[PDB]
Structure formats: C-alpha cells, structure tokens
C-alpha cells in the first residue's frame, strides 16, 4: 500500500539525459597520414623504372 507518490508511480515522467555520447572508435590511421597525398586527373596512373 504505497502511501506516497515517488516518481516510480508517476506516469508520463520526462527522464533526464546527459548531453554527450561515448565512442572509443579506434582511429589511428598512421599509414594514411604518413604517405601524404597527390592529386591527379585520371583513373589510371603509372611510373617508369
């Protein structure tokens, strides 16, 4: 016989959240950052040696 009105008995109770999300997401990417970049204008490149 609950003689009180704690939130557990409440209905339509707007709970509270935290304004952030946690994601580990390993994103080392050493190779992509270690080889630089070179822009071209063709889908097929080649060298000579």
* Binding interface with other proteins (CB under 8 A): 19-20, 32-33, 35-43, 45, 47, 49
CB of 1 to other proteins, least distance (A): 36
Number of neighbouring beta carbons within 10 Å of residue 37 = 6
CB of 40 to other proteins, least distance (A): 6
CB of 7 to other proteins, least distance (A): 22
* Region of residue 8 (left: phi > 0; alpha: psi -120 to 50; beta: else): alpha
Cβ closest to other proteins, residue 1 vs residue 48? 48
**Peptide-bond breaks in the chain following residues (C–N over 2.5 A):** none
């Amino acid at each position: 016989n609950p003689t009180l009105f704690v939130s557990y008995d409440q209905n339509g109770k707007k709970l509270s959240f935290a304004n952030w999300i946690s994601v580990l997401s390993p994103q080392d990417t050493p190779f992509v950052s270690m080889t630089g970049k070179e822009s071209i204008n063709q889908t097929i490149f080649s060298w000579q040696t």
